[PDB]
Symmetry: C2
Subunit: 89 residues, 2 copies
């Protein structure tokens, strides 16, 4: 896979309290905008994924409409969150 | 503990897609009201717990104000959701 080693590392161990910008697909700049919106921790963003019943179209529009992420960035967060759930929830 | 065997069974294996009324503290009648509110699965309610950063006062008021659960029923869901997270998330 051409994804960063973080993608395989995140889906290989608990997420604990790592910062939101730790999720694959979210860069340092995007992490700051979400933090200003009340998502200072990744587990709060994980909850939004659960609220959307894992719907990929609703999840991608939520991130793009919420911060302006590009279509490529949204694909990395979906598979990243979907794969973590496959291992944990 | 005087809790139902479901409490120990729920915190002993994944929650999968079991119905919301499966969470300890939620009875069949309370499960129906949440379902009408869009929580047809327990993992959608688990997400609300994550959104409240596990705050016990905010979580209990959410359930009581959301369905009318009693103070005793709210205590069972908090420890039930908090213990599940301790084993999984």
């Amino acid at each position: 896979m051409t994804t960063s080693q973080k993608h395989r590392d995140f889906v290989a161990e608990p997420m604990g309290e790592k910062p939101v910008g730790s999720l694959a697909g979210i860069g340092e700049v995007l992490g700051k905008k979400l933090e200003e919106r009340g998502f200072d921790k990744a587990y709060v963003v994980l909850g939004q994924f659960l609220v959307l019943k894992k719907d990929e179209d609703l999840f991608r529009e939520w991130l793009k409409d919420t911060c302006g992420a590009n279509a490529k960035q949204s694909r990395d967060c979906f598979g990243c969150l979907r794969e973590w759930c496959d291992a944990f929830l």
